[PDB]
Design a protein around this ligand. Sequence first.
Ligand SMILES: O=c1ccn([C@@H]2O[C@H](COP(=O)(O)OP(=O)(O)O[C@H]3O[C@H](CO)[C@@H](O)[C@H](O)[C@H]3O)[C@@H](O)[C@H]2O)c(=O)[nH]1
Length: 483
Amino acid sequence: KSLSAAAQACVKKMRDAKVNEACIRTFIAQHVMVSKGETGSIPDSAIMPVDSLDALDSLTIECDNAVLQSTVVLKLNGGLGTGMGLCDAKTLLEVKDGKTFLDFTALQVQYLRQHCSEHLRFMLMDSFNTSASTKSFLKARYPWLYQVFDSEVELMQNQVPKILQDTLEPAAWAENPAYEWAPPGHGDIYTALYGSGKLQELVEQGYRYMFVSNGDNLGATIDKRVLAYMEKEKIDFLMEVCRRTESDKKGGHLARQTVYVKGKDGQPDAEKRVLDLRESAQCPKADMESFQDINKYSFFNTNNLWIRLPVLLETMQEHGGTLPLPVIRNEKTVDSSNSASPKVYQLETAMGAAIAMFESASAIVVPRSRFAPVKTCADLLALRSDAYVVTDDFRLVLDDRCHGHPPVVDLDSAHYKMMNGFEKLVQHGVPSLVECKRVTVKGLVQFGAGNVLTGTVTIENTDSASAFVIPDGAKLNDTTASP
Ligand SMILES: O=c1ccn([C@@H]2O[C@H](COP(=O)(O)OP(=O)(O)O[C@H]3O[C@H](CO)[C@@H](O)[C@H](O)[C@H]3O)[C@@H](O)[C@H]2O)c(=O)[nH]1
């Protein structure tokens, strides 16, 4: 079929590698779009703010046991935390008390089975980058998961060809041909579910809902109220959003994309509010100050998502066996560390974007207990610290003393972006942050043993040659400390 010579080269390459067809049909529609100049840009001009949503904390109704039992849980596990200097799955980092993201995830599942739903179904979406390590970490530590890993747990995401910028042909990189390929973002979950046959298998088995969340978000868990809300309101797709803080910078905001709908009368013309997501990579830099404005776009996507599985299966079947999420065209070199390697486009989607694919879509505001993201080492420090606690059901959430506000941790990006620098900052121990509204570390620093930070603290070293090492036991309150 289609159509340009570049596109055909992509189809051939993909088929030769036995990539499944649903992934092929999806990639190619994106390629067609990109070849017409689509970048995935969503300018401010194209959207508006959303201002009223229901709040989860206002809801009280719980779903029945059959509804809960129809619910599958899936965790995202396919990216690497490269910004924090990681070359393997982020879920493998230790978060609290000598346990990793993966450990807590498994414990949350174990707890649900014991207490809540005996046969609860759990899935991990792995990529080629993360699959072997996840599988090995599991074999050792959660054998009940490892049995059934290949068979039931893992959803393997697609690989799609990186395409050359100049031609839109598939990239050649003879030094490492695997670098000619990448997982096409978390938006790929739908394609992978469908293409694998797993989606149909789940519907056949009688599962009706899927709850999906980021691997780095240990807050996120099944909530019976959400399920009940969905049933009562007949929602096919639901996005959990948090009221946006200062700290929410790596992510997406909820938006409204403007339409008036025809009720078998042309007279009027009330218009449905069609919700959408704008990712950071979708915002033209010119409009970036707007994107950053936490008043204007005050609802931030958690990536806690609810999907009514039959509706999804059907939507896809009828859209040619695909879900037509807006492509995001990233620019990279084929090898990330070689700046001179061929320039590419990497085509990706975001799973949140599916809010636009359903007539019955919405969003609900949720508390921070459901959202403890780790995108940065500063996030990691807070989570590691006493600000965060482990619940009976193995979630990590803020200590009650915090009152739902995470401590604002601002760490000098020069020194604490990479995992190594961060480990250095805390070589002598993680400070108490539970009482700290904001901590700012500027320049090169180390915490001492047993430090306690309260109120608003700035630790500043402008010397930059020697580490300001905080003395053991120091209590810092509403102060600037300096050498
Ligand atoms: O190809 C991919 C890319 C990512 N991931 C995983 O998806 C999760 C989220 O990815 P990450 O890079 O951490 O977050 P973003 O894609 O920037 O942002 C997501 O998470 C934010 C909340 O933390 C939301 O605001 C954004 O809208 C949502 O897209 C993590 O578990 C990743 O490992 C995959 O499985 N496959």
